[PDB]
């Protein structure tokens, strides 16, 4: 994501590689949301424990 | 002494035939939000030490 801005700011990119990792992005964003806590805090494993 | 009133008088043939709707002081009371405040709510968890 900090790289995404590097592709954006330095201007070396394309909508495809853009779109490529957008697919990556939403996943791990969501995969993380299985790892955190109900207090809003986040853990390494968390849920199922 | 400086008040304003609600004044119903009805035949008790409609009303023997079917009651009115749940009117008393209790009605007001159990219409209320958070009769008790017991336990914090959910979203707030605690304060640790
Ligand atoms: C990442 O992507 C953006 C998307 O284009 C890059 O372009 C920047 O886009 C913003 C949009 O707000 C530009 O702002 C512009 O301001 C002028 C003047 O008020 C207005 O007429 C335009 O409609 C637009 O709102 C901005 O100029 C443009 N680049 C910049 C910020 O210099 C942006 O470069 C990249 N930066 C980010 C968003 O991290």
From Swiss-Prot, chain A:
This is Alpha-2-macroglobulin. Homotetramer; disulfide-linked. It comes from the Eukaryota. Is able to inhibit all four classes of proteinases by a unique 'trapping' mechanism. This protein has a peptide stretch, called the 'bait region' which contains specific cleavage sites for different proteinases. When a proteinase cleaves the bait region, a conformational change is induced in the protein which traps the proteinase. The entrapped enzyme remains active against low molecular weight substrates (activity against high molecular weight substrates is greatly reduced). It is found in: Secreted. Belongs to the protease inhibitor I39 (alpha-2-macroglobulin) family. The chain holds residues 984 to 1032 of 1474 of the full protein. Secreted in plasma. It comes from Homo sapiens (Human). The lineage of its organism: Eukaryota, Metazoa, Chordata, Craniata, Vertebrata. Glycans are attached at residue 8.
């Amino acid at each position: 994501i900090y790289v995404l801005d590097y592709l954006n700011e330095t201007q070396q990119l394309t909508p495809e590689i853009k779109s490529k990792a957008i697919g990556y992005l939403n996943t791990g964003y969501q995969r993380q949301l299985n790892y955190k806590h109900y207090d809003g805090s986040y853990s390494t494993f968390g849920e199922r424990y | 002494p400086q008040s304003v009133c609600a004044l119903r008088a009805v035949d008790q043939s409609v009303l023997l035939m079917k009651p009115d709707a749940e009117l008393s002081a209790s009605s007001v009371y159990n219409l209320l939000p958070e009769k008790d405040l017991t336990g914090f709510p959910g979203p707030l968890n605690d304060q640790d030490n």
